[PDB]
Design a protein around this nucleic acid. Sequence first.
RNA 1: AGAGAAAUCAA
RNA 2: UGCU
Lengths: 621, 656, 233
Amino acid sequence: TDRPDHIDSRVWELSETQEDWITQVHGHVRRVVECWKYTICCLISNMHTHRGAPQYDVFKWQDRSTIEWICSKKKVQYPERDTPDLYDNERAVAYKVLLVSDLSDHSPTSGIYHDLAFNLEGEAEESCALVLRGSQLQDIKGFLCRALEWVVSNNLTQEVVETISGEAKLQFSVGTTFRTLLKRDTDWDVIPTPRVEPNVPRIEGRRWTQMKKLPLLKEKEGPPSPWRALLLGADSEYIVCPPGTDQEAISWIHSQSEIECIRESKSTPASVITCLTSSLQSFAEGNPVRSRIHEDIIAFGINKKQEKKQSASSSASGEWKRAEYQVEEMSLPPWVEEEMVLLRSDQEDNWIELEKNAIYTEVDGVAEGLVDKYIEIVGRTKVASVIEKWQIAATRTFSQLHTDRSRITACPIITRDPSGNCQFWGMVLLGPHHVKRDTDNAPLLIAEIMGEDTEEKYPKHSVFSLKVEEKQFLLSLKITSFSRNKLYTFSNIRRVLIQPASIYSQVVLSRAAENNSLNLEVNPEIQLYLEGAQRGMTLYQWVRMILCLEFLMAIYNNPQMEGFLANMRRLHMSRHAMMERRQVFLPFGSRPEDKVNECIINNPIVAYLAKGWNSMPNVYY
Amino acid sequence: MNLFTPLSEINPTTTQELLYAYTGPAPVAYGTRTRAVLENIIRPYQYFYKEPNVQRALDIKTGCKEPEDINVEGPSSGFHTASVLKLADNFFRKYRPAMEKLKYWILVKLPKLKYAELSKGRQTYSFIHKRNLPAPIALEETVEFLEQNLRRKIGPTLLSYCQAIADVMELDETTYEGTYTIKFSREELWDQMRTLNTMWKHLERGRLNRRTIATPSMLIRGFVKIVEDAAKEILENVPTSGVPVGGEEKLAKLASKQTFHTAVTGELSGDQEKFNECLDPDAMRLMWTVFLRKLGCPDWIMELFNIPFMVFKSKLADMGEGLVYTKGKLTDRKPLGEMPSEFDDLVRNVVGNSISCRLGMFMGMYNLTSTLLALISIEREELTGSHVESSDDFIHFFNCKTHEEMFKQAETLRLTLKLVGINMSPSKCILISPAGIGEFNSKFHHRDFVGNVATELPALVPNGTNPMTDLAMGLNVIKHSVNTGQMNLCTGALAMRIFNHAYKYAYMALGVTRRTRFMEENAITPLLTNQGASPVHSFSTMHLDEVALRRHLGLLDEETLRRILNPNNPVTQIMEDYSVPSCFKYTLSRHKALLNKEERYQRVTSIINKLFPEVLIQEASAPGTVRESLKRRLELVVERSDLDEERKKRILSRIF
Amino acid sequence: ECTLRALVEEYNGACKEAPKEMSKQFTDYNTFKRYTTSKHAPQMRLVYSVRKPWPISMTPSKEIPLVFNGTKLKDTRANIVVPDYWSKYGSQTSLEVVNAILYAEDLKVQRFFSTEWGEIRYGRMLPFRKPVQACPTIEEVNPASIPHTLLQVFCPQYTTLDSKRKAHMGAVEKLKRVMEPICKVQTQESAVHIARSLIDSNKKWLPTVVDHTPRTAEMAHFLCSKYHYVHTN
RNA sequence: AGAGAAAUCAA
RNA sequence: UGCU
């Protein structure tokens, strides 16, 4: 590692990077040999001038672009590896310093450049001696003999000789101290060489059992699941408002409205209606963001962490034990089928207004026609209106959840029909949100219009009576803290249309493939297991229910739903296999339903899917 | 669920994509990972023996076990040594061309690997600041640490980096002086090298329970990179590997091969239960050693390939913030050992906040090497079928003559994977005897058709930055989705329309907005999609830039064309952008001891970017430091200028 | 030229301000080219960033601050409507500038509107994906020789004899003729990106029912599918 | 309160 | 403060 005393520090520093010495056989020796060659080049090219220019310029151990520049001016070019060490301007010839232990082997290396062979002990080859001046020979001899006692002082002889003999070889070295560290947690050496004789033992295994009947998913028991989604969904309604901006509609509603509670829940106190009215007034006077009132503490849970922690500390009793978290088991609520029916109800408006893309090829026309017909199928539906409401609400909630405001913000859920009339779906109420992480929950006070009131379906929503020009509507009011990522992903709820579109598109294109002409009007008969028996139904209705069920699976998405679907994909595949009159075999300890039954706890749509699966034939024979 | 099972005109497998949750929040993991990581660590000790004997099982250094110790009923952790030797020999004997490519990689491509590619990695725990950092920052920290401790300059090659890591370990004391100096011992540096930083795996789908992911340290990432490049080189040439290159043609071809009618077919689609926590690093050591020995590779190659797994056997997995303990309503965060729990067996392995774990592995590491361990097992004379392996998911094809012999082959497949520590899930593996219905990775196979089904829906939203680049990004993502078979005519066009609507809204151009109301009040007619005009793209036009289309169809005319593409515009003055520089190609407006270092590195990058025009086309390969290289290039570029020599020396006089 | 003194002064400033930084190895550039403490994605914040009162950061130039009550300059940051102001009542450039500022885009567009399409006919075809060249190139250039071709095109002086040898001749001269106007109008990074995109032969997995030429392989998301196939010229 | 699901948010 |  230390620099030899006979080599200048500049040459050593230049050598430090010129080649990778540490990963080569016999390191710290090839570097010294190359330093010797560079020193020879420097001594030959030392303060010698010809035609007003230096006689020798060294093409070695310097930036390559300089070599190409100098060679370009000299009408010569050299590739990378046979690069001459130095070039003589007086004679217009190039040389490479090439040390050899033996001098008898003249061995002209190449015709591109001549060689300057100087042995280790000092004597030069006859050609290189007769082509160079006396002083160069003498001082190269001095440098080489000095290197000679440097070698013999630390007996570098044989490895220097083999360095001269041939090209470098790459090696990797593991030390003795690292080797002991490496073997602390293993029974073998660095290179494992077990003494066992290679063989494959014949282990006795079990048998493969056929799935003669499809598994039956376990329907759970307990209180019916409430409606835990962010918004009402199928039970949502809108209030028609005169055309104008959002502030105009809010002003109209606030001016013509009377509020009276009809059902007050313990989860959402009826006293938080003051916050909603104050925010309506604020957003009607042109200030979306308003100050904090006393009821906001209860409405948004201000300082609820500290007081609950204090209560827990005061009520502390017993001994520390490992945390046991319990997820309450719930059964299938009866309102899932009601939501399925209501979400399929036909609306007057299209509720899906997406700008048509351009058309240039005949292929583009087919795709646009299919998309337009799909929009016609699932557009004039309640589920489309709920999707639009969710899109608007999530976007308006997310756009105001970017700073760290400590004051209440108003995000009305207002949509506009093609005529221009505003539609009051509801309202979202941001609380003080000092959010720092995308996972953190932001307090909200969701106020929105019901269509029907059911205490069992909405145990936490407070119901109020609203009078708007001789028309009465219900008004939801629920306290909910909802995260940033969920609001972001619900701001793109329109992506749910892809899967029903995929199914409809594949059906239409299968018809197009079976015949030799696209139709775009085909509405075939889809056979399904409806109410246990097998009754067919039309494609337009089937796609319409698929959209509603996918929307419910999207707004109700959690570890339970994703685990249920992931572990039910293989059972769906097995059912298809048995439909094709095929045999399904399983290994010894195989209980596929156990992977699914663990995901059925309290999710309403997981329970609904499980009931739908159970209402299907178990054996196909 | 009966709605997702059509009985006519369309297959239940064709409606398989309805069983997904594209739209909807992906679950996020909350709180400590300590319980999850301790559960992951305890599994290899639980299933090492037929009966749970964790306390005695916490004495095994090499996971070698006798054949009668293998659990044929439940999961089995560990491997049979002679089985590994024979299976590796069989995997070498067949697929010999695949191993020939490995020889060329070792002899030619391996020495040319640079450690700069280590900066293109995940977040890496830094032993200097004891905190997660981006990969380039940790890489330069470690390189500087080695330079200060080894009194030498680290070579650009990856082999040089690994050699530096090897030699730094024999030093009794190591320092990182430089205002900020911290000491290390050989044991402390060894522990830091062994330490595996673990964190929750976020935004993961298809699971009820959250898993954790462990990442290596920069002291071992070079060795891991070498081994994984070798594993990828092998796997890219074997027919049985379902890695990103194999998943395209292998499954589709296996779904299209004809079979003799008298023969008996069969597909086994399944998942490997407890894949990460059952394999032992010594099995990979032994397989790699057999591979290198049968290639005639030198001993230093063997040592280089063996160091990563040997360090893995000494891993100190980071538990995390501790276990959760309750005293009624309040909760506390407590480490393992302070109070009794269900992981009291592993208390003796607690080293500081980390825990020792010899048996078993962790996810996020040695993904490709684990695939190799699952393919040497298939190399048996009884197993005459076709196998495709991709990490913990696999599909197998049986071509037999009798059902009994098919079941014998299936059981042989189940047990041969157990000889190396790979237990397929009993409740997740399904065998279809008559013909082809199966699933692999994300694809779903039915008869001659294989249909790729996406796990995550493409983000049909602008990716930020500017309208011109993210419009192209969205169109390219939709095109990629269509090309993979996930989408088609109508689905692709609908995704295009949804993305276009979100694009027009995301730049405040839909409805009555301030920008919009500005356009019709200044008589600024809209010409571009981001301006709210009609869309110029179509399904057949996802690969074309907007402005060229609008010029060709005569939308941007000519006068507006000159003005928007003027290079001297006030507003203005990277992998597949393919967008023109225009006025709409703008940008938006957005431990502390590192910021100045970032700015210094950025300025040195800027000076290199201009003086060296060749540093963008290829990688910087030139001996010397930045100072001398830049100075010599400045001198060279000045001396080649058209200026006379007196101006040349005038310019050179001010260089210092 | 003033560029030489600009480089000299920037070099002196870098040496003065960053002593230790300049002492790093030149080959470390591939490591510290990406040194940044910045990491999901701006896609989750773009909707609010655009609606920020002063979203666009604009360099000082000649822009009117108030037009029809515009308040579009605060003296820096700009307004979201100044790109649209730069589309009418602004400054124009030469026709050659706009013709050369985009060349590969024009080539891709013209190839689209130059091929007649037959009658699309549907069937039960099963498409299998082969790796085919992504887009047509001006000349057939091997993937290994693309960096050397770019080196010859952009910086011939900073090359080496064997770099010239393993560089595909012929394509270099055409790349020069087509990139001479583009280089002077756009940045060097943009120029090299466009040039490589012109010469890159990247094999990408694409649906395939019949053998695809690069011209056909460029446009494949709509020519063939599992239910339809239209035959080109 | 609440969101939520094996443990966090309610700075 | 205006995405069907």
